[PDB]
Amino acid sequence: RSFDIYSRLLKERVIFLTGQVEDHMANLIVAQMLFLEAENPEKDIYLYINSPGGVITAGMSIYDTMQFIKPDVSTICMGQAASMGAFLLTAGAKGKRFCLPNSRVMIHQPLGGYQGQATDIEIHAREILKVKGRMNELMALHTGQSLEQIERDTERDRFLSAPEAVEYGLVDSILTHRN
């Protein structure tokens, strides 16, 4: 009886990624993902996305589980998919990634901040550059775009309307009307 709306939508194999991406909320998407694999490792899974990004590693826990699990993971971004939100979005299974008409996307680069000794600082700094780069490769690969474009387009906050994210390979098309 729509006792719990989301639990109910989990029976249509739909999952919601909303807001701040961080460990726990991420973990709750993983746990859903896995649960759906088992309930049926053959049917498609739905990941709706309206988020501004967040802690990356947490963000990556979702990503790897989207690949790891048997079923294809379709993604539909509504409202906004930014930074890490844009990533998991374009990480949907090819041909199954969407954008509602006025949703909007944003890309940019790994953000961070360490504090301590010079020695330690080079350590964590070298690390963020590696991640900055991997994230760029994994993005080059899901978008079909060169490492040059990503690198340039992601050095600074960059926005895309629904048409443009399609035109960029980020999502495959625009769902305008449930026909």
Residue 94 CA: distances (Å) to CA of 67, 68, 109, 141, 170: 12, 15, 23, 11, 10
43 or 152, CB closer to a second copy? Answer: 152
Report the nearest approach of a second copy to the CB of residue 44 (Å). 15
Report the nearest approach of a second copy to the CB of residue 176 (Å). 7
In this structure, the dihedral spanned by the alpha carbons of residues 90, 140, 113 and 127, taken in order and rounded to 10 degrees, is: 130
Is position 61 annotated as part of the catalytic site?
no
Please list, in sequence order, all residues whose beta carbon lies within 8 angstroms of the beta carbon of residue 163, skipping any fewer than 6 positions away.
Answer: 174
Is position 83 annotated as part of the catalytic site?
yes
State yes or no: residue 7 binds a second copy (CB under 8 A): yes
Token pair of 169 as six digits: 């390979």
| Active-site pick, 108, 146, 161, 177 | 108
> If residue 2 lies in a helix (H) or strand (E), which one and from where to where?
none
State yes or no: residue 118 binds a second copy (CB under 8 A): no
Query: What is the footprint of a second copy within residues 13-32 (CB under 8 A)?
Result: 14, 16, 18-19, 23-24, 26-28, 30-32
Query: What is the footprint of a second copy within residues 131-170 (CB under 8 A)?
Result: 131, 134, 137-138, 141-142, 144-149, 151-152, 156-159, 161, 169
Phi, then psi, of 168 in degrees rounded to 5? -105, -10
Task: Answer for the pair 171, 97: CB distance below 8 angstroms, yes or no.
Answer: yes
Distance CA 66, CA 37 (A): 10
| Active-site pick, 83, 124, 142, 161 | 83
State yes or no: residue 37 binds a second copy (CB under 8 A): yes
Report the nearest approach of a second copy to the CB of residue 36 (Å). 9
Count interface residues toward a second copy (CB under 8 A).
86
Residues known to be catalytic: 83, 108
